[PDB]
Design a protein around this ligand. Structure first.
Ligand SMILES: CCCCCCCCCCCCCCC(=O)O
Ligand SMILES: [Cl-]
Length: 162
């Protein structure tokens, strides 16, 4: 457990809808550096289920193209923590959200020597929210991040932030 900030009292139904990946950071440069980097993902929409799982729509650059992806993050016993099903079991943690403006989340690999970690600042609108970005930078201050990206409003309105 690298990340030690989770949202108390998270109501997952209230994160439904449209989001923008305004800023991203990761523990290793290689996780975000190229357009095709493994955790360079651009959130489109969050769809919580009635049983409280979380369907994620996002874009990712794969094979010289911007591809649509649909991911399912299954709930755990902790409201703020979800598990993505993949070869390596990947936890999604919601750090902080106000539902109406911003949501901060991190994804971490369960076990790895110096396990990898990416975090995003999501916002509801294609605007630079300095307040959400300050909350994101404060949340990351002790995490061992080595790359950070952020996107301008023009980019946020383009597929894969071109
Ligand atoms: C509550 C906020 C949840 C947003 C979580 C987004 C998780 C994104 C995980 C994507 C991991 C890469 C998938 C693409 C691939 O399999 O190549
Ligand atoms: Cl659990």
């Amino acid at each position: 457990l690298i990340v030690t900030q989770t949202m108390k009292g998270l109501d997952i139904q209230k994160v439904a809808g449209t989001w923008y990946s305004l800023a991203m950071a990761a523990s290793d440069i290689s996780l975000l550096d190229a357009q095709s980097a493994p955790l360079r993902v651009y959130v489109e929409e969050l769809k919580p289920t009635p049983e409280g799982d979380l369907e994620i729509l996002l874009q990712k650059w794969e094979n010289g193209e911007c591809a649509q992806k649909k991911i399912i993050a299954e709930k755990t016993k902790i409201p703020a923590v979800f598990k993505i099903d993949a070869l390596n079991e990947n936890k999604v943690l919601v750090l902080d959200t106000d539902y109406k403006k911003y949501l901060l989340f991190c994804m971490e690999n369960s076990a790895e020597p110096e396990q990898s970690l990416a975090c995003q600042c999501l916002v509801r609108t294609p605007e630079v929210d300095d307040e959400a970005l300050e909350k994101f930078d404060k949340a990351l201050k002790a995490l061992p991040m080595h790359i950070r990206l952020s996107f301008n409003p023009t980019q946020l309105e383009e597929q894969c932030h071109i």
